[PDB]
Amino acid sequence: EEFVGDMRIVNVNLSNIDILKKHETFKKYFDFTLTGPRYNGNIAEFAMIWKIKNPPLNLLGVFFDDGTRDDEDDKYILEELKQIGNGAKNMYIFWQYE
Amino acid sequence: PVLEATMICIDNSEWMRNGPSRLQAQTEAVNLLCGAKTQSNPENTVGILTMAGKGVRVLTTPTSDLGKILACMHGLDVGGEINLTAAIQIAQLALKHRQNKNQRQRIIVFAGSPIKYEKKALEIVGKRLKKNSVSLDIVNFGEDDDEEKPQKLEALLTAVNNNDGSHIVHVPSGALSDVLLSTPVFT
């Protein structure tokens, strides 16, 4: 259990990002045509478009389930994103397995 | 669509390494399945328990919070052997004491281990679940050289199955979530 404010940090390990094409929650927000891990500024469909800075090799993306936040490429590293949930109840962090 | 409380019974038995970790394939399927269930109806609830380690552990009582559900499976332990009867009893009581009684009651068991129970034992459990209005989906995986296991699990299903509301899926070692996505566990 890790919380930042009232936002739960939810580590999700995937064998492959293709698993999320079949996920009835996460298929709505992922854009599978984009290279490198992204985060969403809002919860519009296909919102995960914003480039996470200096990502660790196995990081696949970040989904904030609520709130709105700053939307810039290569501005925030993973650890800085954890303070801008801005009302998100959950910050989903998708990882490559092993 | 359907309104439903589901308890998922995880196999975190020492077996789950052998045969992607059989633990990891289970976690991914559970993740997609909690996705389908919470997305199809906002008032659906899903709970999670582990069957092996040093005994039956509830990681979460039924909830509609997907984050709580997926978080409580990060960093799963693996070991011991499943306690299937204790798992099902605890799953049925959790469903009995659901908040919204308008919810249908469903248990999902991932049977990834040898099944160390007689047919008669499992039929009795299956008949009690039926009298308690609980449906059962069984995922049979990891044939640890037990032609005995598949038979015993189909006998459990027969005793419970009602209105074709209960299902079994046998998956070969040679894509767990791809398989289930087209099976009624998903549909």
Residue numbers in the entry:
A (entry chain A): 36 to 133
B (entry chain B): 1 to 19, 23 to 177, 180 to 192
Kindly provide excerpts from the paper associated with this entry.
SAP05 binds both the von Willibrand factor type A (vWA) domain of Rpn10 and the zinc-finger (ZnF) domain of multiple members of two distinct plant transcription factor families, known as SQUAMOSA-PROMOTER BINDING PROTEIN-LIKE (SPL) and GATA BINDING FACTORS (GATAs). The SAP05 protein comprises a globular compact structure with five β-strands that form an internal triangular mixed β-sheet core. β-strand 1 (β1) locates on the long end of this triangular core and connects via a loop–helix–loop–helix–loop structure to β2 at the opposite surface near the tip of this core. The SAP05 residues binding ZnF and vWA are located at opposing surfaces of the effector with the ZnF binding surface comprising the loop-dominated surface (loop surface) and the vWA-binding surface the β-sheet-dominated long end of the triangular β-sheet core (sheet surface). Our data show how the bacterial SAP05 effector has evolved as a functional adapter of the 26S proteasome to bypass the canonical UPS cellular proteolysis pathway and enable ubiquitin-independent degradation of structured eukaryotic proteins.
As Rpn10vWA formed aggregates upon purification in the absence of SAP05, Rpn10vWA was coexpressed with SAP05 and purified as a complex using the same general method. The SAP05 sheet surface comprises two parallel β-strands, β1 and β5, as well as two loops separated by an α-helix. The interaction is mediated by eight SAP05 amino acids, including R43 and N48 located on β1, S50 on loop 2, H58 on loop 3, T60 on α2, N125 and Y127 on β5, and Y132 on the loop following β5 of SAP05. Each of these residues interacts with one residue of Rpn10vWA, except for T60 that interacts with two residues, and S50 and H58 form two interactions with E31 and N34 of Rpn10vWA, respectively. Four of the interactions involve double or single hydrogen bonds and one salt bridge, and other interactions comprise nonbonded contacts. All Rpn10vWA residues that interact with SAP05 locate on α-helices. The Rpn10vWA interaction is largely mediated by polar forces. Thus, the SAP05 sheet surface contains rigid secondary β-sheets and α-helix structures that are held in place by hydrogen bonds within SAP05, as opposed to the ZnF-binding loop surface that involves protruding loop structures that may be more flexible. Structural superimposition of SAP05 interactions with vWA domains of plant Rpn10 and PSMD4 revealed that SAP05 loop 3 clashes with H38 of PSMD4 precluding a SAP05-PSMD4 interaction. The structural superposition of SAP05–Rpn10vWA complex onto the spinach 26S proteasome did not reveal obvious steric clashes with proteasome components.
